[PDB]
Symmetry: C3
Subunit: 404 residues, 3 copies
């Protein structure tokens, strides 16, 4: 029952200790409180009545903002995003390129506005300040952790960019993990437009801050000693829209290629597998059969562990956007496999993160520009940071499945 | 009657004098002839028979070029830009992204071709030469003023780029105002594809050259002393298409975000206004109530001044493309408010310009690259240039409304 | 009969000799074997039974890869690329922007993957090694020739980029011609999606390697003495998708402008021609009337030489993508002119190449970046390389028409 979930938490913490740079350097106050906060935050917004009301209140607010931004894409693509599309094409009336992608543009512009008004910095300063006073973490890495709740892995350290080139290896690692254990506000609204429950996306985004610090200070404890704009609001909006556009193009081109490549892989595996009496062999079967124990370990039922492993595995070997693209049909009535409500939540939390190998290259570019002489350290701690970011997603998935 | 329009002209000229850098330095020949030319040009193509035939002859020529370029977008988007779209989606069959945006690509390529053939330079040299000999303005700023009739604010000073880094503060200001008081040929054909009368777009584009010089030499008189390529035509076309593409993407992403942001604003104003007994409070009401006297001053009837203020205000606080997007439905039979034919013209002229705060950043980039040590002067005279560019649009709107 | 084709080969070789930099420097072994290989390769895959089975086997493999990549574009554009489009819009249901363009993205990602796995380098090393040992050509130019079978003109010399800045004028010319006589794998799958027979595209791509070396060593013999990475596979795929996206945008914007410009040209020619009693005068008539002898010379029947000249001429004065766009309707049942099966093949081979004036600018950019001090030589030998690349397409078209 609930004993399998508690064991899963110990295992995830166990692997982090086994892969630690120095187990004797682990601060029990830091990693003890970090796990406590992430667990208490999960208990707050997923179990207790008041916490559930605040989460559903914030999610409904986000849901309204998404629909407001949909007035912009309704102007551009007109009837191609109307209700007539379902009367003509049926299920194929939902055009991903016109429905989901423009949401990245609007939200990137919105966050850019909220940054100009100082609204974003005000929230991060509170959340980041509460983390460093409770975990003992440094000022910079705590602000980057709180920033990563809303923005991306390369946009979050911008709030503390003059402290990046001279921060310790443990600090930089935590900064890398803070962005790998979380997502961005843009893609969040995109995933919500695909059918993913906003309550799960918002929850996982907030739990990514202490969870990101947790496995960062576990796999890389602090052994050294730390230290310590657009002209107008319309320019900020226009600048954010351009950034969202460039992101929307890249994501769209990525999904065309990757899904196409997977389709190519499945075609080859159908022939390769046939040589061993398995002509129905596909990528989903491999990822499902390989990630089934990991899914079963975090709280997914035995008869649903294989199906859940297909999505968790795809999120790891590729990225979460490709995984969510194959998990989205499982959130509708036309789902090939009817999953339990708890399982749908666990997959949603275990997929809510930029934790993948391809994000290392992005960290080498964006974060690497903030510290050009630190690109050697980033690439070196790259693989370790992905694991630490992965464990944070699995931990948040185990906690979520525990209180459900 | 016509007395309200003549008073409006005096007020607009009055504000320019009150905001002048030096009223005693104002050249009466320059600003006297500039206003005379803009007024005589308005009287020419909007009142006298022969001038109306030349304007309708040029507009029909432009209209044919647009339809010719529509063969390119008809190939790419096939039936999505066909007549079957209106039989299926009705009014929503008109897809802005496929109908209007590709026009920016084709026209940017066309102008790039006409530049290679020396056709563009030939016309600018004539118009620019006639301005400097009649107003006493310098060679460079007069050519940039004539160039801004056809191309954008950052593309126009390219004809005199070796004279930009060493031109006086009054010259640079006039160059800034020349591009703020006008638009580009690309977006012009785009606005014409939205229902905006081409006769008004072409007229306002030509009146922007003396009008841009008028309020520039009024708010910033000359107190100092002035001075004085693609391999083939296919490469020029291909280069212009790429420039139009990048512009089409930026405009499209801007409209998705801004309209979405306005929709978000209207949602918040509906709650904020409800606290003061005004739950129906929107952005249009504010902009309408605030710009109604300004609209009434330039020649808009009392019962239509508020509605006209919504578009003029939106053009100012944001940009003219967002304003035209909300004014375009008022040019069809499905218009919520039936405006008089004169009012439709006044709004069309008062919106035909890049006069906004966001264009300062564009001037800092494009025009600033032509003179990197002059970015300080551009940002300093930025706000003043927007006002001077705004007054030119209002003046052209007052003149247009006078002869109608 | 077959005598007209053999004469055509002599003429094409004749022009190359007449335009040679030094006819006495022509290596008879090099240009003798190069023509022999291209001719024997044509005889292999177009005449003999076994060679036809290997070509149809490779084409069917490519055809399957295209359909696999179509799963990615089916996810993004949903029902807009479904069969319901033909039930609603009929022939206009085929949306070029959603059907053909995304194929460039997927294939660019695929080739990027095959490069990471060393699969591409393995094939090029074999083909390139077999050319230098049979023709006596240098190591670098032979590898670039073999690479150009699969990738573009600026991507092919990347396999030998440290040898580019110090290669002779004859080597650099052959490198330029290798990319002008061939296409890329991305656009190849795009042309195949337009109805162009894959067997012809694959054949012409392979015949472009010895044909590119043939007319390069004919028009520019060697008179001097020659000499002698992504972190993971997912990063390689993501990087290739981004490159394909940027290419897809440029091609799409080019087709909108060029077709629109041609439509503008046809409008003007209709009036200009009317002054000389030819109101039906268009661009196709000119290109057809002018390239008819050239089409008749390579093996096109007398009554079909004019129609074929329209496509060959358009491929020359513009690019092959614009030509293929106007030739694609002639491959369907709704073709205005029913062409013979041999003629359809000849046009397909004569159009399969980047041989145009606009590709010189691309060579100055991409290839010029590999050798910044050699941009002077590239621009100088630019026009000659286009001709040499053109003759290679015509030669491959004559050979193809000979064995059919
Ligand atoms: C969709 C409808 C929403 C409606 C909302 C209305 C928004 C109004 C924006 C005005 O903001 C100002 O804009 C200036 C122009 O950029 C800035 O000056 C900046 O730029 C000036 C010059 O361009 C300088 O003089 C200043 O020093 C410099 O701060 C200035 O900071 C900023 O406060
Ligand atoms: C859609 C159908 C329309 C059909 C219209 C046909 C257009 C024909 C374009 C030819 O123009 C020439 O192209 C050369 C190639 O770029 C240029 O040479 C330039 O580049 C050469 C080398 O590449 C150099 O040798 C030259 O010095 C240099 O001027 C040259 O100036 C230019 O006159
Ligand atoms: C759609 C489903 C398809 C499923 C296919 C699964 C693909 C698996 C990719 C793994 O490849 C590895 O990834 C590392 C990460 O980038 C590379 O390390 C590189 O980067 C590391 C750090 O980031 C360094 O430690 C290494 O030295 C450096 O080689 C490494 O070379 C590479 O072998
Ligand atoms: N805002 C962002 N910042 C950085 N990388 C991002 C962002 N959004 C998406 N990505 C990248 O795209 C992938 C798929 O969403 C992520 O795993 C990440 O690598
Ligand atoms: N050709 C152009 N050059 C510069 N800015 C442009 C151009 N076209 C549009 N814009 C910008 O986009 C806004 C909306 O059209 C304008 O007010 C201006 O800021
Ligand atoms: N892969 C490529 N590399 C370089 N140029 C290309 C490529 N694909 C297309 N082009 C350019 O676009 C034109 C039309 O396909 C070509 O003639 C060539 O100039
Ligand atoms: Na983040
Ligand atoms: Na202009
Ligand atoms: Na090639």
């Amino acid at each position: 029952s609930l004993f399998m979930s508690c064991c899963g938490m110990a295992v995830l913490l166990g692997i982090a200790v086994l892969l630690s740079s120095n187990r004797k350097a682990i601060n029990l106050r830091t990693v003890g409180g970090a796990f406590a906060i992430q667990f208490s935050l999960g208990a707050f917004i997923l179990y207790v009545p008041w916490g559930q009301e605040l989460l559903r209140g914030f999610s409904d607010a986000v849901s309204n903002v998404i629909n407001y931004g949909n007035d912009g894409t309704s102007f551009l693509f007109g009837g191609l995003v109307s209700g007539k599309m379902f009367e003509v094409f049926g299920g194929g009336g939902f055009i991903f390129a016109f429905r989901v992608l423009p949401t990245l543009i609007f939200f990137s512009a919105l966050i850019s506005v909220l940054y100009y008004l100082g609204v974003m910095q005000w929230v991060i300063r509170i959340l980041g300040g509460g983390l460093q006073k409770a975990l003992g973490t440094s000022r910079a890495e705590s602000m980057s952790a709180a920033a990563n709740i809303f923005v991306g892995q390369t946009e979050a350290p911008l709030v503390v960019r003059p402290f990046v080139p001279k921060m310790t290896q443990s600090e930089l690692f935590a900064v890398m993990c803070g962005g790998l254990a979380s997502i961005a506000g843009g893609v969040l609204a995109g995933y919500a437009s695909m059918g993913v429950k906003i309550e799960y996306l918002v929850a996982a985004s907030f739990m990514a801050a202490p969870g990101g610090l947790l496995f960062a200070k576990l796999m890389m404890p602090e052994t050294e000693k730390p230290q310590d704009k657009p002209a107008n609001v319309i320019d900020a909006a226009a600048g954010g829209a351009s950034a969202g556009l460039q992101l929307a193009l890249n994501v769209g081109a990525m999904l065309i290629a990757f899904i196409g490549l997977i389709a190519l892989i499945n075609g080859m595996l159908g022939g390769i597998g046939g040589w061993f009496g398995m002509p129905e062999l596909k990528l989903e079967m491999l990822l499902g059969w390989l990630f089934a124990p990991l899914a079963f370990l975090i709280g997914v039922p035995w008869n649903e562990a294989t199906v859940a492993g297909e999505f968790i595995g795809l999120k790891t070997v590729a990225n979460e956007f490709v995984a969510y693209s194959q998990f989205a049909p499982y959130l509708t009535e036309a789902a090939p496999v009817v999953l339990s409500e708890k399982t749908k939540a666990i997959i949603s939390f275990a997929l809510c993160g930029f934790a993948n190998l391809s994000s290392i290259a992005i960290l080498l570019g964006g974060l690497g520009s903030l510290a050009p002489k630190r690109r050697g350290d980033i690439a070196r701690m790259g693989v370790k940071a992905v694991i630490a970011g992965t464990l944070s997603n699995l931990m948040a998935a185990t906690i979520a499945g525990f209180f459900l």
